[PDB]
Design an enzyme around this catalytic site. Structure first.
Site, short mmCIF file in Angstrom:
data_model
loop_
_atom_site.label_atom_id
_atom_site.label_comp_id
_atom_site.label_asym_id
_atom_site.label_seq_id
_atom_site.Cartn_x
_atom_site.Cartn_y
_atom_site.Cartn_z
N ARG A 27 -10.37 7.04 1.11
CA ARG A 27 -10.54 7.05 2.55
C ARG A 27 -11.49 8.14 3.00
O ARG A 27 -11.55 9.21 2.41
CB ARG A 27 -9.20 7.20 3.25
CG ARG A 27 -8.21 6.22 2.70
CD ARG A 27 -6.99 6.10 3.56
NE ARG A 27 -5.88 5.56 2.78
CZ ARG A 27 -4.62 5.60 3.16
NH1 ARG A 27 -4.30 6.16 4.32
NH2 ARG A 27 -3.66 5.10 2.39
N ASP A 76 -11.68 0.22 -3.76
CA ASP A 76 -10.80 -0.66 -4.50
C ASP A 76 -11.03 -0.52 -6.01
O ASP A 76 -12.14 -0.75 -6.50
CB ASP A 76 -11.00 -2.11 -4.05
CG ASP A 76 -10.00 -3.05 -4.66
OD1 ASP A 76 -8.80 -2.75 -4.60
OD2 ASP A 76 -10.41 -4.10 -5.20
N1 LIG Z 1 -5.12 -5.99 -12.34
C1 LIG Z 1 -4.71 -5.27 -11.28
N2 LIG Z 1 -5.40 -4.18 -10.89
C2 LIG Z 1 -4.96 -3.53 -9.81
N3 LIG Z 1 -3.93 -3.77 -9.00
C3 LIG Z 1 -3.26 -4.87 -9.40
C4 LIG Z 1 -3.59 -5.65 -10.50
N4 LIG Z 1 -2.70 -6.72 -10.66
C5 LIG Z 1 -1.86 -6.57 -9.65
N5 LIG Z 1 -2.14 -5.48 -8.87
C6 LIG Z 1 -1.36 -5.14 -7.68
O1 LIG Z 1 -2.13 -5.46 -6.52
C7 LIG Z 1 -1.45 -4.81 -5.44
C8 LIG Z 1 -2.32 -4.80 -4.21
O2 LIG Z 1 -3.56 -4.12 -4.52
P1 LIG Z 1 -4.75 -4.24 -3.46
O3 LIG Z 1 -5.82 -3.32 -3.99
O4 LIG Z 1 -4.24 -3.97 -2.09
C9 LIG Z 1 -5.30 -5.94 -3.62
P2 LIG Z 1 -7.07 -6.05 -3.45
O5 LIG Z 1 -7.69 -5.47 -4.69
O6 LIG Z 1 -7.51 -5.52 -2.13
O7 LIG Z 1 -7.37 -7.62 -3.54
P3 LIG Z 1 -7.59 -8.54 -4.88
O8 LIG Z 1 -6.41 -8.31 -5.79
O9 LIG Z 1 -7.73 -9.95 -4.35
O10 LIG Z 1 -8.87 -8.09 -5.53
C10 LIG Z 1 -1.05 -3.45 -6.02
O11 LIG Z 1 0.09 -2.89 -5.42
C11 LIG Z 1 -0.92 -3.69 -7.51
O12 LIG Z 1 0.46 -3.54 -7.91
MG LIG Z 2 -9.66 -6.13 -5.42
MG LIG Z 3 -7.15 -3.66 -5.64
#
Ligand SMILES: Nc1ncnc2c1ncn2[C@@H]1O[C@H](COP(=O)(O)CP(=O)(O)OP(=O)(O)O)[C@@H](O)[C@H]1O
Ligand SMILES: [Mg+2]
Ligand SMILES: [Mg+2]
Ligand SMILES: [Cl-]
EC number: 2.7.6.3
Length: 158
Positions: free
Chosen positions: A82, A95
């Site tokens: 952030r 991310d």
């Molecule tokens: N391979 C992976 N890498 C990272 N986080 C993962 C993951 N598989 C599952 N997760 C889970 O994903 C949850 C949400 O992560 P976020 O970062 O908010 C989703 P995002 O990356 O924004 O979208 P996306 O998963 O569609 O790319 C986490 O709390 C984590 O436990």
């Molecule tokens: Mg992602």
């Molecule tokens: Mg993520």
């Protein structure tokens, strides 16, 4: 074990954040960076007001357990993810996703590896292909095969 991590930043000017994240990744215990892809630009596919995303892939050698690595990537998101502008801290704009973890398949409440949607995403496949052109997925699918089949357009470098 070689872990492949996708880096995405949504910032208008993301280079500083991405560099801070890369440095932090390199500081993870029992781990070291093997290679980092180029930085790639992807425009938003919808509301065009949003900044272009910066995408990259990192190969990280680690002796950590997958969920331990996730703890660290999530910590880095909290610590570097952030940015403050003027009088307010912004929301998460960094991310860090685990694309692959060696030749392991993971299906827990916290972790789905290979990443559940990477095969649909040129922005995750192309940087990975740059640094691991011969990559084979746990189930025997090949990165080259996925790109060949879907014909995703190449990404412009940042
Ligand atoms: N391979 C992976 N890498 C990272 N986080 C993962 C993951 N598989 C599952 N997760 C889970 O994903 C949850 C949400 O992560 P976020 O970062 O908010 C989703 P995002 O990356 O924004 O979208 P996306 O998963 O569609 O790319 C986490 O709390 C984590 O436990
Ligand atoms: Mg992602
Ligand atoms: Mg993520
Ligand atoms: Cl499954």
């Amino acid at each position: 074990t070689v872990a492949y991590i996708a880096i995405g930043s949504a910032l208008a000017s993301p280079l500083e954040q991405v560099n801070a994240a890369l440095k932090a990744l390199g500081d993870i215990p029992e781990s070291h960076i093997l290679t980092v892809s180029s930085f790639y630009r992807t425009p938003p596919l919808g509301p065009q007001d949003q900044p272009d995303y910066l995408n990259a892939a990192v190969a990280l050698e680690t002796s950590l357990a997958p969920e331990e690595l996730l703890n660290h990537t999530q910590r880095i998101e909290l610590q570097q993810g952030r940015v403050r502008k003027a009088e307010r801290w912004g929301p998460r704009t960094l991310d860090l996703d685990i694309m692959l973890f060696g030749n392991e398949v993971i299906n827990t409440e916290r972790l789905t590896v290979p990443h559940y949607d990477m095969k649909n995403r040129g922005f995750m496949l192309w940087p990975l292909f740059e640094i691991a052109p011969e990559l084979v997925f746990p189930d025997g699918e090949m990165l080259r095969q996925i790109l060949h089949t879907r014909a995703f357009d190449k990404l412009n470098k940042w």
